[PDB]
Coordinates of C-alpha atoms in Angstrom, one line a residue:
Chain A
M1 CA -25.3 -24.1 -8.6
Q2 CA -28.7 -24.3 -9.7
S3 CA -30.2 -24.2 -6.0
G4 CA -28.7 -20.6 -5.7
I5 CA -30.3 -19.4 -8.8
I6 CA -33.5 -20.6 -7.6
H7 CA -32.9 -19.1 -4.5
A8 CA -31.9 -15.8 -6.0
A9 CA -34.4 -15.7 -8.5
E10 CA -37.4 -14.1 -6.7
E11 CA -36.7 -14.9 -3.3
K12 CA -35.7 -11.7 -1.8
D13 CA -32.8 -13.6 0.4
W14 CA -29.3 -12.9 -1.1
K15 CA -27.2 -13.9 1.8
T16 CA -28.1 -17.6 1.5
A17 CA -27.9 -17.4 -2.3
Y18 CA -24.1 -16.2 -1.6
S19 CA -23.6 -18.8 0.4
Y20 CA -24.7 -21.8 -2.3
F21 CA -22.9 -20.0 -5.1
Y22 CA -19.6 -20.1 -3.4
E23 CA -19.9 -24.2 -2.4
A24 CA -20.5 -24.2 -6.2
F25 CA -17.7 -22.1 -7.1
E26 CA -15.7 -24.3 -5.0
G27 CA -17.0 -27.1 -6.3
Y28 CA -16.3 -26.6 -9.7
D29 CA -12.5 -25.1 -8.9
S30 CA -12.0 -28.3 -7.2
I31 CA -12.2 -30.3 -10.8
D32 CA -11.2 -27.2 -12.8
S33 CA -14.7 -26.8 -14.6
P34 CA -15.2 -24.0 -17.1
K35 CA -18.4 -23.2 -15.2
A36 CA -16.1 -21.8 -12.3
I37 CA -16.3 -18.5 -13.8
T38 CA -19.9 -18.3 -14.3
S39 CA -19.8 -19.2 -10.6
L40 CA -17.8 -16.6 -9.9
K41 CA -19.8 -13.9 -11.4
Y42 CA -23.0 -15.0 -10.3
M43 CA -21.3 -14.6 -6.5
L44 CA -20.5 -11.3 -7.3
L45 CA -23.8 -10.1 -8.6
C46 CA -25.1 -11.9 -5.6
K47 CA -22.7 -9.1 -3.3
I48 CA -23.2 -6.4 -5.6
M49 CA -27.4 -7.0 -4.8
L50 CA -26.6 -7.4 -1.4
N51 CA -25.4 -3.7 -1.6
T52 CA -21.6 -4.5 -0.1
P53 CA -19.9 -3.9 -3.4
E54 CA -16.5 -3.0 -1.7
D55 CA -15.6 -7.3 -1.3
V56 CA -16.3 -7.9 -5.0
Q57 CA -12.2 -6.6 -4.8
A58 CA -11.7 -9.1 -2.3
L59 CA -13.7 -12.0 -3.6
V60 CA -11.3 -11.0 -7.1
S61 CA -8.3 -11.3 -5.5
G62 CA -9.1 -14.0 -3.5
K63 CA -6.4 -16.8 -3.7
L64 CA -8.9 -19.4 -5.6
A65 CA -10.0 -16.9 -7.9
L66 CA -6.7 -15.3 -9.7
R67 CA -6.4 -17.9 -13.0
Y68 CA -10.7 -16.8 -13.2
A69 CA -9.5 -13.1 -14.0
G70 CA -10.4 -12.4 -17.2
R71 CA -13.4 -10.8 -19.2
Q72 CA -16.1 -11.3 -17.0
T73 CA -14.6 -10.3 -13.7
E74 CA -13.6 -7.4 -14.9
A75 CA -17.1 -6.9 -16.2
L76 CA -18.9 -7.7 -12.5
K77 CA -16.3 -5.7 -11.1
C78 CA -16.8 -2.5 -13.0
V79 CA -20.6 -2.7 -12.2
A80 CA -19.6 -3.0 -8.7
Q81 CA -17.3 0.3 -8.9
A82 CA -20.4 1.9 -10.3
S83 CA -22.3 1.1 -7.7
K84 CA -19.9 2.4 -4.8
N85 CA -19.3 5.5 -7.0
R86 CA -23.1 6.3 -7.2
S87 CA -22.7 6.4 -10.6
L88 CA -26.1 5.8 -13.2
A89 CA -23.7 6.8 -16.5
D90 CA -21.1 4.8 -15.2
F91 CA -23.2 1.7 -14.4
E92 CA -24.8 2.3 -18.2
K93 CA -21.3 2.8 -19.6
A94 CA -20.6 -0.6 -18.0
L95 CA -23.5 -2.3 -19.7
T96 CA -22.7 -0.9 -23.3
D97 CA -19.6 -1.9 -22.8
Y98 CA -19.8 -5.4 -21.9
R99 CA -23.2 -5.9 -23.2
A100 CA -22.1 -9.7 -24.1
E101 CA -21.4 -10.3 -20.7
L102 CA -23.8 -8.7 -18.9
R103 CA -26.9 -8.8 -21.0
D104 CA -26.4 -12.1 -22.5
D105 CA -26.8 -13.9 -19.2
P106 CA -30.3 -14.8 -18.2
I107 CA -30.4 -14.3 -14.8
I108 CA -28.0 -11.2 -14.5
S109 CA -30.4 -9.8 -17.4
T110 CA -33.8 -10.3 -14.9
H111 CA -31.4 -8.7 -12.0
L112 CA -30.4 -5.9 -14.0
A113 CA -33.8 -3.9 -13.9
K114 CA -33.7 -4.1 -10.0
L115 CA -29.9 -3.0 -9.9
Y116 CA -31.0 0.0 -12.1
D117 CA -34.0 1.1 -9.7
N118 CA -31.2 0.8 -6.9
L119 CA -28.6 3.0 -8.3
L120 CA -30.9 5.3 -9.6
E121 CA -32.3 5.8 -5.9
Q122 CA -28.6 6.3 -5.0
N123 CA -27.6 8.6 -7.3
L124 CA -30.4 10.9 -6.6
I125 CA -29.7 10.7 -3.1
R126 CA -26.0 11.8 -3.6
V127 CA -26.8 14.3 -6.1
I128 CA -29.1 16.2 -3.7
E129 CA -27.4 15.7 -0.4
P130 CA -25.7 19.2 -0.9
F131 CA -29.1 21.3 -1.4
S132 CA -32.0 23.0 0.6
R133 CA -33.9 23.9 -2.7
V134 CA -32.4 22.5 -5.5
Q135 CA -34.3 22.6 -8.6
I136 CA -35.6 19.2 -10.4
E137 CA -34.3 20.6 -13.6
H138 CA -30.9 20.9 -12.8
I139 CA -31.4 17.5 -10.9
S140 CA -32.4 16.0 -14.2
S141 CA -29.4 17.3 -15.7
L142 CA -27.1 16.4 -13.3
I143 CA -28.5 12.9 -13.5
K144 CA -28.8 12.4 -17.4
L145 CA -32.5 11.6 -17.3
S146 CA -35.9 13.2 -18.0
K147 CA -37.4 15.9 -15.9
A148 CA -40.8 14.1 -15.4
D149 CA -39.0 10.6 -14.6
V150 CA -36.4 12.6 -11.8
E151 CA -39.8 14.3 -10.5
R152 CA -41.9 10.8 -10.5
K153 CA -38.9 9.1 -9.1
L154 CA -38.4 11.7 -6.5
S155 CA -42.3 11.7 -5.6
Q156 CA -41.8 7.8 -5.1
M157 CA -38.9 8.1 -2.7
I158 CA -40.7 11.1 -0.7
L159 CA -44.0 8.6 -0.3
Chain B
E1 CA 30.1 -43.6 19.6
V2 CA 33.1 -45.4 18.0
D3 CA 35.2 -42.4 16.8
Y4 CA 37.4 -42.5 13.4
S5 CA 39.4 -38.9 14.2
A6 CA 42.8 -40.9 13.7
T7 CA 41.4 -43.1 10.8
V8 CA 39.9 -40.1 8.8
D9 CA 42.6 -38.3 9.1
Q10 CA 45.5 -41.1 8.0
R11 CA 42.7 -41.8 5.0
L12 CA 41.8 -38.1 3.8
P13 CA 45.7 -37.1 2.3
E14 CA 45.5 -40.3 0.4
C15 CA 42.2 -39.9 -1.2
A16 CA 43.0 -36.5 -2.3
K17 CA 46.7 -37.5 -3.9
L18 CA 44.8 -40.5 -5.5
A19 CA 42.1 -37.6 -6.9
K20 CA 44.2 -35.5 -8.4
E21 CA 46.5 -38.4 -10.0
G22 CA 43.5 -39.3 -11.7
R23 CA 41.4 -42.1 -9.4
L24 CA 38.4 -40.3 -9.3
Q25 CA 35.7 -43.3 -9.2
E26 CA 37.8 -45.3 -6.7
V27 CA 38.6 -42.5 -4.9
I28 CA 34.8 -41.8 -4.2
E29 CA 34.0 -45.4 -3.8
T30 CA 36.1 -45.8 -1.0
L31 CA 35.2 -42.4 0.6
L32 CA 31.4 -43.5 0.1
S33 CA 32.4 -46.9 2.1
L34 CA 33.8 -44.3 4.7
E35 CA 31.0 -42.2 5.0
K36 CA 28.9 -45.2 5.4
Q37 CA 31.1 -46.0 8.4
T38 CA 31.2 -42.9 10.0
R39 CA 27.2 -42.4 9.5
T40 CA 27.0 -45.9 11.2
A41 CA 29.3 -44.6 14.2
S42 CA 27.5 -41.5 14.2
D43 CA 30.5 -39.5 14.1
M44 CA 29.6 -35.7 13.0
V45 CA 33.1 -34.2 12.6
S46 CA 34.3 -37.5 10.3
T47 CA 31.0 -37.6 8.0
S48 CA 31.1 -33.4 7.7
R49 CA 34.9 -34.2 6.6
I50 CA 34.4 -37.1 4.4
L51 CA 31.3 -35.1 2.8
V52 CA 33.1 -31.7 2.2
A53 CA 36.4 -33.7 1.2
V54 CA 34.0 -35.8 -1.7
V55 CA 32.6 -32.6 -3.0
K56 CA 36.1 -30.5 -2.8
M57 CA 37.6 -33.5 -4.9
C58 CA 34.8 -33.5 -7.1
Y59 CA 34.7 -29.9 -7.8
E60 CA 38.6 -30.0 -8.7
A61 CA 37.7 -31.8 -11.4
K62 CA 35.3 -30.2 -13.8
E63 CA 33.1 -33.1 -13.2
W64 CA 29.9 -31.0 -12.8
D65 CA 27.5 -34.4 -13.4
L66 CA 29.3 -36.3 -10.8
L67 CA 29.0 -33.3 -8.6
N68 CA 25.3 -33.3 -8.8
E69 CA 24.7 -36.7 -8.7
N70 CA 27.2 -37.1 -5.6
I71 CA 25.7 -33.6 -3.7
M72 CA 22.2 -35.5 -4.1
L73 CA 22.7 -39.2 -3.3
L74 CA 24.7 -38.0 0.1
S75 CA 22.0 -35.3 1.0
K76 CA 19.7 -38.5 0.7
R77 CA 21.9 -41.2 2.5
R78 CA 19.9 -43.0 4.7
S79 CA 20.0 -41.4 8.3
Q80 CA 22.6 -38.8 7.1
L81 CA 23.7 -35.8 9.7
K82 CA 22.2 -32.8 9.4
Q83 CA 25.5 -30.9 10.2
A84 CA 27.4 -32.7 7.5
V85 CA 24.8 -32.0 5.0
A86 CA 24.9 -28.3 6.3
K87 CA 28.4 -28.3 6.2
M88 CA 28.4 -29.8 2.1
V89 CA 26.1 -27.0 1.0
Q90 CA 28.1 -24.5 2.5
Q91 CA 30.7 -25.3 0.8
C92 CA 28.8 -26.2 -2.4
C93 CA 27.3 -22.8 -1.8
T94 CA 30.9 -21.3 -1.8
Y95 CA 31.8 -23.1 -5.0
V96 CA 28.7 -21.7 -6.6
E97 CA 29.7 -18.1 -5.9
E98 CA 32.9 -19.1 -7.4
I99 CA 31.6 -20.7 -10.5
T100 CA 31.2 -18.2 -13.7
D101 CA 29.3 -20.3 -16.2
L102 CA 25.4 -19.6 -16.6
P103 CA 23.4 -22.5 -17.2
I104 CA 26.2 -24.5 -15.1
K105 CA 25.9 -22.4 -12.0
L106 CA 22.2 -22.4 -13.2
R107 CA 22.1 -26.4 -12.8
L108 CA 24.1 -26.3 -9.4
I109 CA 21.9 -23.9 -7.8
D110 CA 18.7 -26.0 -8.5
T111 CA 19.9 -29.0 -7.5
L112 CA 21.0 -27.5 -4.7
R113 CA 17.6 -25.7 -3.9
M114 CA 16.2 -29.2 -4.6
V115 CA 18.2 -30.8 -1.9
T116 CA 18.0 -28.3 0.8
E117 CA 14.0 -27.5 0.2
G118 CA 12.3 -27.8 3.8
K119 CA 15.1 -28.3 6.0
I120 CA 15.7 -26.4 9.4
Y121 CA 19.3 -26.8 9.8
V122 CA 20.3 -25.3 5.9
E123 CA 17.6 -22.4 5.2
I124 CA 19.9 -19.5 5.3
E125 CA 22.0 -21.5 2.6
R126 CA 18.5 -21.6 0.5
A127 CA 17.7 -18.1 0.9
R128 CA 21.0 -17.2 0.2
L129 CA 20.7 -19.5 -3.2
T130 CA 17.1 -18.3 -3.9
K131 CA 18.9 -14.5 -4.0
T132 CA 21.5 -15.3 -6.1
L133 CA 19.1 -17.2 -8.6
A134 CA 16.6 -14.3 -8.5
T135 CA 19.3 -12.0 -9.2
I136 CA 20.7 -14.3 -12.3
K137 CA 17.3 -14.1 -13.7
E138 CA 16.9 -10.6 -13.4
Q139 CA 20.2 -9.8 -14.9
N140 CA 18.9 -11.9 -17.7
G141 CA 15.8 -10.0 -17.5
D142 CA 13.0 -11.9 -16.3
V143 CA 12.0 -9.4 -13.9
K144 CA 8.2 -11.1 -13.0
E145 CA 10.3 -14.7 -12.5
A146 CA 12.5 -12.6 -10.0
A147 CA 10.0 -11.5 -8.0
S148 CA 7.5 -14.6 -8.0
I149 CA 10.6 -16.6 -6.8
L150 CA 12.0 -14.0 -4.1
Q151 CA 8.5 -13.6 -3.3
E152 CA 7.7 -17.9 -2.5
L153 CA 10.3 -17.0 0.4
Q154 CA 9.4 -16.6 4.0
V155 CA 11.8 -14.5 5.6
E156 CA 10.1 -13.0 8.8
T157 CA 9.9 -17.2 10.0
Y158 CA 13.8 -18.4 9.9
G159 CA 14.7 -17.8 13.6
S160 CA 18.4 -18.5 12.7
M161 CA 19.0 -16.0 10.2
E162 CA 20.3 -12.5 11.6
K163 CA 17.7 -9.2 11.6
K164 CA 19.8 -7.7 9.4
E165 CA 19.8 -10.4 6.6
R166 CA 16.1 -10.5 7.0
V167 CA 15.6 -7.2 6.5
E168 CA 17.9 -7.3 3.5
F169 CA 15.6 -10.0 1.9
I170 CA 12.5 -8.1 2.5
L171 CA 13.5 -4.8 1.1
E172 CA 14.9 -6.8 -1.8
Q173 CA 11.6 -8.7 -2.4
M174 CA 9.4 -5.3 -1.8
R175 CA 11.8 -3.6 -4.7
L176 CA 11.7 -6.4 -7.4
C177 CA 7.6 -6.6 -6.3
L178 CA 7.5 -2.8 -7.4
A179 CA 9.5 -3.3 -10.3
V180 CA 6.9 -6.1 -11.2
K181 CA 3.8 -3.3 -10.4
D182 CA 2.8 -5.7 -7.6
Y183 CA 1.3 -2.6 -5.0
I184 CA -0.8 -5.1 -3.0
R185 CA 2.1 -7.8 -2.8
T186 CA 4.1 -4.5 -2.0
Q187 CA 2.4 -3.4 0.9
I188 CA 1.7 -6.8 2.3
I189 CA 5.5 -7.3 2.0
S190 CA 6.2 -4.3 3.7
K191 CA 4.2 -4.9 6.4
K192 CA 6.7 -7.3 8.1
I193 CA 9.6 -4.8 8.4
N194 CA 9.4 -3.4 12.2
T195 CA 10.1 0.3 11.9
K196 CA 11.7 0.1 15.6
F197 CA 14.7 -1.9 14.2
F198 CA 15.9 1.0 12.3
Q199 CA 17.4 2.7 15.4
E200 CA 19.8 0.0 17.0
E201 CA 23.4 0.2 15.7
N202 CA 23.8 0.9 11.9
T203 CA 20.2 0.5 10.2
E204 CA 21.0 3.8 8.1
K205 CA 21.2 2.4 4.5
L206 CA 18.7 -0.1 5.1
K207 CA 16.3 2.8 6.8
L208 CA 17.0 4.7 4.1
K209 CA 16.0 2.4 0.9
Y210 CA 13.2 0.8 3.0
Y211 CA 11.7 4.8 3.5
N212 CA 12.2 5.1 -0.1
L213 CA 10.5 1.8 -1.0
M214 CA 7.7 2.8 1.0
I215 CA 7.7 6.5 -0.6
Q216 CA 7.2 5.4 -3.9
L217 CA 4.6 2.7 -3.0
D218 CA 2.5 5.6 -1.1
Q219 CA 3.4 8.1 -3.8
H220 CA 1.4 5.6 -6.4
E221 CA -2.3 6.6 -5.6
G222 CA -1.2 9.5 -3.3
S223 CA -0.6 8.9 0.5
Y224 CA 0.6 12.4 1.1
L225 CA 0.3 12.4 4.6
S226 CA 2.0 9.1 5.1
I227 CA 4.6 10.2 2.2
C228 CA 5.2 13.2 4.6
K229 CA 5.9 11.2 7.4
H230 CA 8.6 8.7 5.7
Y231 CA 10.3 12.0 4.6
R232 CA 10.4 13.4 8.1
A233 CA 12.0 9.8 9.2
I234 CA 14.1 9.8 6.1
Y235 CA 15.7 13.3 7.8
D236 CA 15.6 12.0 11.2
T237 CA 18.9 9.9 9.9
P238 CA 22.0 11.4 11.0
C239 CA 23.4 10.1 7.7
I240 CA 21.3 12.9 6.1
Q241 CA 21.3 15.3 8.5
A242 CA 25.0 15.6 8.2
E243 CA 25.4 16.9 4.7
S244 CA 23.7 20.3 4.5
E245 CA 21.8 19.5 0.8
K246 CA 20.1 16.1 1.8
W247 CA 18.9 17.1 4.7
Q248 CA 17.7 20.5 3.0
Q249 CA 16.2 18.2 0.1
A250 CA 14.3 16.2 2.8
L251 CA 12.6 18.8 4.8
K252 CA 12.1 20.2 1.3
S253 CA 10.0 17.2 0.5
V254 CA 8.1 16.8 4.0
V255 CA 7.1 20.5 3.8
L256 CA 5.5 20.1 0.2
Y257 CA 3.8 17.0 1.1
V258 CA 2.0 17.9 4.3
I259 CA 1.1 21.2 2.5
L260 CA -0.2 18.8 -0.1
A261 CA -2.1 16.2 2.5
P262 CA -5.7 16.9 2.9
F263 CA -7.1 18.7 6.2
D264 CA -7.3 16.7 9.2
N265 CA -6.5 16.6 12.8
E266 CA -3.4 14.5 12.5
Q267 CA -2.3 17.0 9.0
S268 CA -2.4 19.8 11.5
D269 CA -0.6 18.4 14.2
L270 CA 1.8 17.5 11.8
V271 CA 2.2 21.0 10.0
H272 CA 2.6 23.0 13.2
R273 CA 5.5 20.5 14.3
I274 CA 7.1 20.9 11.2
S275 CA 6.5 24.7 11.1
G276 CA 8.2 24.9 14.8
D277 CA 11.4 23.9 13.6
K278 CA 14.7 25.8 13.4
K279 CA 16.4 24.4 10.8
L280 CA 13.5 25.8 8.4
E281 CA 15.2 29.1 8.4
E282 CA 17.6 27.7 5.5
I283 CA 14.5 27.0 3.5
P284 CA 12.7 30.6 3.7
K285 CA 10.3 30.2 0.9
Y286 CA 9.3 26.9 2.0
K287 CA 8.7 28.3 5.4
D288 CA 6.9 31.0 3.9
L289 CA 4.3 28.7 2.1
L290 CA 4.0 26.4 5.4
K291 CA 2.9 29.8 6.9
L292 CA 0.5 31.0 4.1
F293 CA -1.1 27.3 4.4
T294 CA -0.9 27.6 8.7
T295 CA -2.6 30.9 8.6
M296 CA -6.5 30.9 8.7
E297 CA -6.8 33.7 5.8
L298 CA -7.5 33.8 2.4
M299 CA -5.1 33.0 -0.3
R300 CA -5.5 33.1 -3.9
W301 CA -4.1 30.7 -6.3
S302 CA -2.9 33.4 -8.8
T303 CA -0.8 35.1 -5.9
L304 CA 0.9 31.6 -4.9
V305 CA 1.7 30.6 -8.5
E306 CA 3.1 34.1 -8.9
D307 CA 5.4 33.9 -5.8
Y308 CA 6.5 30.6 -5.7
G309 CA 5.4 29.6 -9.1
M310 CA 8.7 28.7 -10.4
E311 CA 10.8 28.2 -6.9
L312 CA 8.6 24.8 -6.2
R313 CA 8.7 23.8 -9.8
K314 CA 11.8 24.8 -11.7
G315 CA 13.8 25.9 -8.7
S316 CA 17.2 27.8 -8.8
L317 CA 20.6 26.7 -8.1
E318 CA 21.2 27.6 -5.1
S319 CA 18.3 26.1 -3.7
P320 CA 17.7 23.0 -6.1
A321 CA 13.7 21.9 -7.0
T322 CA 12.4 18.7 -6.2
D323 CA 10.7 16.1 -8.2
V324 CA 7.2 16.7 -5.8
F325 CA 6.5 18.9 -9.1
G326 CA 8.4 18.4 -12.1
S327 CA 7.4 18.5 -15.5
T328 CA 6.2 14.9 -15.5
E329 CA 2.5 13.7 -15.5
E330 CA 2.8 13.2 -11.9
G331 CA 4.2 16.5 -11.1
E332 CA 1.0 17.8 -13.2
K333 CA -1.1 15.7 -11.2
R334 CA 0.5 17.0 -8.0
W335 CA 0.3 20.9 -9.2
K336 CA -3.6 20.3 -9.5
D337 CA -3.6 18.6 -6.2
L338 CA -2.0 21.1 -4.8
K339 CA -4.7 23.7 -6.9
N340 CA -7.8 21.7 -4.9
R341 CA -5.7 22.1 -1.4
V342 CA -5.7 25.8 -2.1
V343 CA -9.6 25.5 -2.8
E344 CA -10.4 23.5 0.2
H345 CA -8.5 25.7 2.4
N346 CA -10.4 28.8 1.2
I347 CA -13.9 27.4 1.6
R348 CA -12.8 26.0 5.5
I349 CA -11.5 29.8 5.7
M350 CA -14.9 31.1 4.6
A351 CA -16.7 28.4 6.3
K352 CA -15.4 29.4 9.9
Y353 CA -16.0 33.2 9.2
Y354 CA -19.4 33.6 7.1
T355 CA -22.9 32.6 8.4
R356 CA -24.4 32.9 4.5
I357 CA -22.4 33.7 1.6
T358 CA -23.7 34.2 -2.3
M359 CA -22.7 31.5 -4.7
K360 CA -21.7 34.7 -7.0
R361 CA -19.1 35.9 -3.7
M362 CA -18.0 32.3 -3.6
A363 CA -16.9 31.8 -7.1
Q364 CA -15.1 35.3 -6.8
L365 CA -13.3 34.5 -3.9
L366 CA -12.3 30.9 -5.2
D367 CA -11.1 32.3 -8.4
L368 CA -13.2 29.5 -10.3
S369 CA -16.7 29.5 -12.0
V370 CA -19.9 29.3 -10.5
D371 CA -20.3 25.7 -11.5
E372 CA -17.0 25.0 -10.7
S373 CA -17.3 26.2 -7.0
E374 CA -20.7 24.5 -6.9
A375 CA -19.1 21.0 -7.8
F376 CA -16.1 21.4 -5.7
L377 CA -18.5 22.3 -2.2
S378 CA -21.2 19.7 -3.0
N379 CA -18.3 17.1 -2.9
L380 CA -16.9 18.3 0.1
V381 CA -20.1 18.3 1.6
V382 CA -20.8 14.8 -0.1
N383 CA -17.4 13.6 1.4
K384 CA -18.2 15.4 4.8
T385 CA -15.0 17.3 5.2
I386 CA -17.2 20.7 5.9
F387 CA -21.0 21.4 6.7
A388 CA -22.6 23.7 4.1
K389 CA -26.5 23.8 2.3
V390 CA -26.8 25.6 -1.2
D391 CA -30.1 27.0 -2.2
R392 CA -29.9 26.9 -5.6
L393 CA -32.7 28.7 -6.2
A394 CA -31.7 31.6 -4.1
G395 CA -28.1 31.2 -4.7
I396 CA -26.9 31.3 -1.2
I397 CA -24.5 28.8 0.7
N398 CA -25.4 28.6 4.2
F399 CA -22.8 27.5 6.7
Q400 CA -25.1 27.3 10.1
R401 CA -26.4 24.5 11.5
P402 CA -29.7 24.0 12.4
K403 CA -30.4 25.7 16.0
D404 CA -32.4 23.6 18.5
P405 CA -34.5 25.0 21.3
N406 CA -32.0 22.5 23.6
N407 CA -29.0 23.9 21.8
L408 CA -30.1 27.7 22.5
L409 CA -31.1 27.4 26.0
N410 CA -27.5 25.5 26.5
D411 CA -25.7 28.4 24.8
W412 CA -27.6 30.4 27.4
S413 CA -26.9 28.5 30.2
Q414 CA -23.3 28.1 29.0
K415 CA -22.8 32.3 29.3
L416 CA -24.3 32.3 32.3
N417 CA -21.9 29.9 33.9
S418 CA -18.9 31.7 32.5
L419 CA -20.2 35.1 33.6
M420 CA -20.5 33.5 37.1
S421 CA -17.1 32.4 36.9
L422 CA -15.7 35.5 35.5
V423 CA -17.3 37.6 38.5
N424 CA -15.4 35.3 41.0
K425 CA -11.9 36.0 39.4
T426 CA -12.5 39.7 39.7
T427 CA -13.2 39.7 42.7
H428 CA -10.0 37.6 43.6
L429 CA -8.5 40.3 41.5
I430 CA -10.1 43.2 43.7
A431 CA -9.4 41.5 46.7
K432 CA -5.6 41.0 46.0
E433 CA -5.3 45.0 44.9
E434 CA -7.0 46.2 47.6
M435 CA -4.8 44.0 49.7
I436 CA -1.6 45.2 47.7
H437 CA -2.8 49.0 48.3
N438 CA -4.8 49.3 51.3
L439 CA -2.4 48.8 54.5
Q440 CA -0.4 52.0 53.7

């Protein structure tokens, strides 16, 4: 568990982090520990950041994880669904709803900013897909952000 | 190796006489000794007879504790004969069928299951006992427990059981899972059934039950094409075809769901095949709706609701309606989906014809506001159903892809090739005409 935490903090290599978290989850489940929920939530976060949210459902429904269904699994599942739908508003709703879960965990809090940036990027792409000369004001209205922020992000993306 | 047929025949009636007189304990001791001797000698028939007779004697005494203890002991007896245990379990299953009291039935069934757990020779008996226990639990009012109990079984592997019984067990598991609201498990279970089974001799009721369960499962989340396929399979059954009302309802559902299904190659092929049916005449309005959705011309939601609004929703006594568009929330959702289908069809047609259109005109022709039409078109483009580019500043929707010089030159080359082929064909026709009209 600690090895995965360290090799997910800032290393920018998430496959090995997920492997380590899976090992930790198996270990804690074997002895019926109360931290298996933490291991499951951290590996779900690893998958989300690896940008394959579709596997979150499979991980949660996996045979070993049924007894661990609950608030934390639901929170991370909702975050994964928000990422899949490419909805920054959905992500913000998930945060403001399950704040106790996704904002009191130090590691999840550490990665929240990067997840927010990635979701903003993908949301802008999805919003501007069916356009050729869309207006920045319209994009800002669609994505519920300020015009200046949207313009700056689009400039960075073009760069 | 050493037969005991004469000895068993001579002894059993005397044991029965003593048992009915009230000599239960002594008779059971003596029969246990005889069973030990028969098992040692490896006399299958003698051991089976002794076991069945002992169970019957214990049953016709209302000695339930004695029956349970005897069954367990005689099952656990060392080097017991599998055939003897099977015969005893069959007789005990008959007894469990006959018995009526609830807790007594439960305890006997539990003991039989514990005895026959994990044994190839007695596996159909265990499956039937589990089915009966699940039925009893459901009737008592534990649907979740009944579903769990019946799902614990694995019927696709029992090679001795007949295909009819296996299919019945699978269908019961599907029904219980649907009643407990476990759709992933229901789909996993339903995967077991091989559709080729419902063709051999009598797979009519089973076929109908399976297809109805599949219809429910798919309709849970919306699988209109698969629902239409299931309804076609139902409509194909001779039992449904014989009665006019049943096949009429089946065809109505098929047409309606094929209409509701989103557009794709498979959907188009299914729609064409359904339209190419003679029986549709008896359902005139639905045939008109199918023709409306197959013709490549704009259609209006208001006109559709005016013409077919009541026939497909409330119905008339001559042709009854269907639960496709009922007054429930499912029906409301399906009505909304039909409206979305109409909008998508209009967009597809106005993309087949039209290089550039204005957003105001597209909204005016789709009968929606500009914002709603923009959202619909954007969703279609994102999902990749149709190609479109919105120039919001000018309010123009471009349906033509960019034209590369390679594409332009290829089009020109194709035109030239077609021209040459047409010249050759014209020359052939001219030669034929000259031959026909020149000799005379």
